[PDB]
Design a protein around this nucleic acid. Structure first.
Ligand SMILES: [Mg+2]
Ligand SMILES: [Mg+2]
Ligand SMILES: [Mg+2]
Lengths: 96, 202, 145, 48, 48, 154, 196, 140, 54
RNA sequence: UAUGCAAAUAUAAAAUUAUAGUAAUUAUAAAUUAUAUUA
């Protein structure tokens, strides 16, 4: 566990750099097309004349945000012969 | 269409900030700002032309096909009466260059050089802005372009055709032309690589 | 006054001189001249980061004018003080009575809060603050905690 | 004198001094770049 | 010192070098300050 | 017995630096040239009279992370935590003040609002103004100056 | 010169005395070996001995990190597929292709997303090799015997508590119900080993 | 050609290498460069020479009068490093020096933790990186 | 505590009777916010995905 | 499964074996050895 943690932190410390380069890319898009335009591209309701349009858009966002129940997979239990491990959830060999 | 996620904003990195006087939430139904900035002009242009966007000015001149700067310059010289004829074309060029990148032209390179040497030395401690200017102005040089070509060359960025082009660019020299163009210690490399250099840079 | 050429604001200068002359190598007077000279130029001469506001001065220019009005070219101590006596006599409204920034002689404590606290060690704190000493208008039956 | 001046005469090239005073000039492959023209001496080889 | 006050009035305070050198215009200045991350240390002959 | 693959070619993690350190070459070359039989390379002709720094020592020999070994590669904030908190608060209350000197690159031969404002802040504190009011007062100073400027502009 | 200082003409350049007695070590580190591949002990990528190392144990889980192809793998679209499944199960009189359109939109984006993540991850492999990995040069930290010294420090403590006597000794395990099955006069709970 | 790599390190890999326009530090850099070319010195040795070279007494405490976190501006470094390659005869065609020194920096600008380097892989050592992953290398 | 509580009958020998009530006190972390410090490798790559798609 | 009895790796040592005469040594660790569901 300890070892893999110290791996994860490295990965993450890199992915925050990747995410930064992305956000930076987004900035360059901003000063190519102008800020407002970019906001338009991102779903800004500048075309909303009246509240009914707003409530349509937000009704859309509501129907997205509502979370359908997640069916989360549980790994099956593997029954081996003399059962060196009854923790066995995979077919890999283990060091007992 | 919407993302595969809907999240809140990513946290702000230490040292990172939204630039000053920059409206971050601005929408197209916001009222037009009064001044002329790349931002204000690009949002404006979005409202006027719709979604027409061009990488550079010559791309615009590509889309209009046969309309030179000065021709339009006459339209604007008509509209704003007190402008000159020169300032009328200038107005066009400045608007286009605000909506897109600045033009690449010998004229503007010359103007840049002329101002650079009209200012002279500066009171900066290490003559900082002058080393800035100098280091920049050599990026536009012939020799620099030749070097850029040799560098992309080293990375195998050409094809067979580029090669046969380089070859027959070489065959066109005489021993005399070699003796003259080897004086610069660079320019003969440019005579051979001219088309390929022009290809990478453009 | 040009009594000396050299001035520095650097902490523990002496250590730095020591360690700088440790890294030096030869004894030839060319070398010595340069090492000493470079030391001087980089620290003790004020080429950079120095202003006239910042150097400590008793004779700051109004004061110079005053001194030369009083003490310059006077052939006795007696002449000096009947001169002085005649200068004390000037009104506050005369042209020739000129002002200057005075350097404030520093206070001991530097702030009023410090004044109170400093005063407070010669005194006895009350167990209760002034607003609750006086018994309440209601009555609080004291129980165990 | 910790760091003495050593040999300062430039009247020939380093390779000419090396050539004349050293057998080492005859075996250019056996010497690294930092020592190439630098030796004025004859060297014995002893194979242990 | 019972008496010396004559001198005390034209006397001079010592100048504020600490903040003057603090507030000097600097070429590393940043609009928002970030503390540096941790540097690699030496974990011993096996770890490096 | 399983071991990490490259342990055969594993470097000595304590001593692998020694070989390359400038002093070593100074000494060795020093007694090589002294012989009379070696033509000194030019770097030696130079650092002969400008020998390298004394007390820069590796971290391998001194096992201290906190030792700042090099006069060159050192990074330690000149800013004490109090200052840090101060100009950080000033900076976050207005972005204009923070960006003014350095928007793109740092222009270091011009004064900066962050600094001028810190100066007059301390000035206010020693005239007995408390924290909050001193900050908002200095900020008002900046904003009013800017008001002048853009009135002129209009 | 024309190539590395740690590699000469015939193979890895043999510095320590181990190399001169055992010079198989210079030219062969495994079946992923080439001649340019000496001195760079890691071999290409997707190749034998290409795996980067972290404190000596190799990194074989990379895809599992970015959540491409793992059991714990990140899923892009769930709400869509669930919504569509619900639609299918409810009734057959009305058929909704609206749901299948929202979904196939979602997927159409997902493709490019994934190629992006993969690319970024390969960049991570490169960075990890440059600035982190020791190239299998340091001792494993990931199995308890590697930490023996740590445990020793603890055994020592339990010894000094015992008057510096019983090292590695532990209390005798008693019985499931030793406390309530024993008569007065016999120890009902396990004592310190020195106390026996 | 490895020369350009070395110079890239002296320019970008060193916080506060003094004022690099001054004839003193400039001469340090010049000499060390000519000693990396012509193989008289290891790159590692010449680098550690450069950063350990003698600059000015109480160096850090003069550095507190300019720098906050001890990171100077990188213009003087690159202008000097190009100057040295021009005044030494390093290249047959004059421009190439400046171009390469510039280009190699621009490419590294995009990399995660760009101006730091692992000390073992930074320069010549027994074990090396593959020619694609070498740092200021032409093959990246 | 758990020991005492158990032998006095004030806490069950297995199970957490307050499990739901206690959820306010635990930092439940929304997948929508990003905590720069996590050992979660999923959340990081999720936000990376999000911004890239943006 | 710690009321009898029971010193004992946590190191003070002089080449291996061997009850302290037998044989001539022994012990040792990173070279090399094809299949463990990664985009
Ligand atoms: Mg085994
Ligand atoms: Mg092996
Ligand atoms: Mg293998």
């Amino acid at each position: 566990r300890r070892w893999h943690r110290r791996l994860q932190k490295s990965f993450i410390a890199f992915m925050q750099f990747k995410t930064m380069k992305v956000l930076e890319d987004q900035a360059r898009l901003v000063n190519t097309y102008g800020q407002a335009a970019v906001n338009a591209a991102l779903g800004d309701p500048w075309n909303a004349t009246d509240n009914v349009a707003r409530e349509r858009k937000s009704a859309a966002v509501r129907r997205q945000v509502r979370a359908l129940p997640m069916v989360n997979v549980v790994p099956k239990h593997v029954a081996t012969m003399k059962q060196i491990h009854n923790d066995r959830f995979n077919y890999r060999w283990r060091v007992n | 269409h919407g993302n595969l996620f809907y999240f809140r904003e990513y946290p702000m990195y230490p040292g990172e900030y939204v630039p000053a006087e920059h409206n971050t939430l601005s929408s197209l139904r916001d009222e037009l700002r009064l001044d002329l900035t790349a931002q204000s002009l690009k949002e404006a242009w979005m409202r006027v032309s719709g979604g027409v966007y061009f990488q550079s000015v010559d791309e615009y001149y590509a889309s209009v096909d046969g309309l030179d700067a000065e021709q339009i310059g006459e339209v604007l010289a008509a509209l704003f009466p007190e402008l000159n004829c020169y300032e009328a074309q200038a107005l066009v060029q400045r608007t286009l260059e605000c909506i897109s990148r600045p033009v690449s032209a010998a004229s503007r390179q010359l103007s840049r050089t002329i101002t650079a040497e009209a200012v002279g030395l500066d009171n900066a401690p290490g003559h900082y802005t002058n080393f800035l200017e100098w280091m920049g102005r050599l990026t536009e040089t012939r020799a620099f372009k030749t070097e850029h070509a040799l560098f992309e060359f080293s990375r195998r960025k050409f094809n067979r055709d580029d090669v046969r082009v380089m070859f027959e660019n070489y065959r066109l020299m005489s021993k005399a032309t070699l003796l003259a163009d080897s004086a610069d210690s660079y320019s003969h490399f440019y005579t051979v690589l001219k088309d390929f250099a022009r290809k990478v840079a453009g | 006054l040009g009594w000396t050429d050299l001035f520095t604001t650097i902490p523990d200068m002496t250590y730095h001189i020591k360690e700088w002359f440790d890294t030096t190598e030869h004894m030839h007077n060319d070398a010595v001249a340069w090492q000493l000279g470079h030391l001087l130029e980089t620290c003790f001469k004020m080429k950079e980061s120095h202003s006239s506001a910042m150097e400590r001065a008793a004779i700051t220019p109004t004061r110079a004018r005053w001194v030369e009005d009083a003490f310059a070219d006077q052939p006795s101590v007696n002449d000096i003080m009947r001169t002085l006596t005649e200068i004390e006599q000037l009104p506050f409204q005369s042209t020739h009575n000129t002002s200057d920034e005075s350097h404030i002689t520093p206070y001991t404590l530097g702030s009023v809060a410090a004044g109170v606290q400093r005063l407070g060690e010669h005194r006895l704190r009350y167990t209760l603050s002034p607003w609750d000493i006086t018994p309440p208008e209601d009555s609080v039956v004291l129980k165990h905690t | 004198d910790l760091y003495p001046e050593g040999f300062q005469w430039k009247h020939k090239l380093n390779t000419e001094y090396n050539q004349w005073r050293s057998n080492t000039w005859l075996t250019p492959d056996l010497i690294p770049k930092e020592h190439r023209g630098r030796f004025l001496c004859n060297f014995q080889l002893n194979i242990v | 010192s019972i008496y010396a006050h004559a001198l005390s009035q034209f006397a001079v305070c010592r100048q504020p070098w600490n903040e003057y050198i603090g507030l000097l215009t600097k070429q590393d200045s940043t609009p928002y300050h970030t503390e540096p991350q941790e540097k690699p240390a030496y974990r011993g002959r096996k770890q490096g | 017995y399983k071991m990490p693959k490259n342990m055969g070619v594993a470097p000595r993690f304590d001593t692998w630096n020694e070989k390359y350190e400038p002093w070593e070459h100074m000494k060795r070359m020093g007694r090589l040239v002294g012989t009379g039989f070696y033509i000194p390379p030019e770097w030696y002709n130079h650092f002969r009279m400008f020998p390298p720094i004394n007390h820069n020592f590796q971290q391998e020999k001194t096992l201290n992370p906190h030792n700042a070994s090099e006069p060159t590669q050192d990074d330690t904030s000149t800013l004490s935590p109090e200052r840090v908190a101060l100009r950080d608060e000033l900076a976050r209350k207005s972005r204009l003040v923070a960006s003014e000197g350095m928007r793109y690159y740092n222009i270091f031969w011009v004064r900066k609002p962050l600094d001028t404002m810190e100066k007059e802040y301390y000035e206010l504190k020693r005239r007995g103004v408390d924290h909050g009011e001193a900050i908002r007062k200095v900020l008002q100073g900046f904003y009013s100056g800017l008001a002048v400027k853009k009135r002129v502009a209009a | 010169r024309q190539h590395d200082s740690g590699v000469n003409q015939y193979g890895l350049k043999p510095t320590n005395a181990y190399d001169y007695i055992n010079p198989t070590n210079l030219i062969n580190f495994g079946r992923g070996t080439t001649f340019d591949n000496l001195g760079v002990r890691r071999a290409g990528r997707g190749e034998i001995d290409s795996s980067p190392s972290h404190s000596g144990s190799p990194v074989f889980t990379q895809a599992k990190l970015i959540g491409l192809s793992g059991e714990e793998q990140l899923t892009m679209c769930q709400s869509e597929t669930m919504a569509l499944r619900l639609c299918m199960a409810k009734a057959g009189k009305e058929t909704c292709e609206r749901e299948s359109r929202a979904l196939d939109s979602c997927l159409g984006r997902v493709g490019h997303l994934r190629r992006a993540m993969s690319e970024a991850c390969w960049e991570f492999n490169d960075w990890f090799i440059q600035n982190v990995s020791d190239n299998h040069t340091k001792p494993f930290q990931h199995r308890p015997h590697d930490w023996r010294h740590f445990y020793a420090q603890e055994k020592l403590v339990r010894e000094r508590q015992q008057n510096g006597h019983a090292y590695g000794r532990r209390p005798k395990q008693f019985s499931f119900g030793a406390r309530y099955v024993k008569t007065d006069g016999y120890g009902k709970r396990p004592r310190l080993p020195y106390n026996k | 050609d490895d020369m350009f790599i070395w110079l890239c390190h002296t320019a970008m890999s060193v916080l506060n290498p003094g004022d690099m326009r001054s004839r003193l530090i400039y001469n340090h850099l010049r000499i060390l460069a000519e000693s990396v070319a012509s193989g008289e010195m290891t790159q590692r040795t010449a680098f550690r020479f450069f950063e350990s070279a003698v600059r000015s007494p109480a160096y850090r405490e003069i550095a507190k009068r300019q720098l906050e976190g001890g990171a100077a501006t990188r213009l003087a470094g690159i202008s000097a490093a190009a100057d040295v390659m021009r005044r030494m005869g390093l290249t047959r065609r004059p421009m190439s020096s400046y171009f390469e020194l510039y280009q190699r920096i621009v490419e590294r600008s995009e990399a995660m933790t760009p101006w730091g380097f692992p000390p073992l892989f930074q320069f010549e050592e027994r074990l090396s990186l593959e020619p694609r992953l070498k740092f200021f290398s032409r093959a990246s | 505590a758990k020991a005492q509580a158990i032998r006095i009958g004030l806490y069950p020998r297995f199970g957490n009777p307050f499990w739901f009530r206690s959820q306010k006190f635990r930092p439940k972390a929304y997948q929508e916010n990003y905590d720069p410090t996590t050992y979660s490798t999923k959340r990081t790559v999720e936000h990376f995905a999000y911004n890239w798609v943006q």
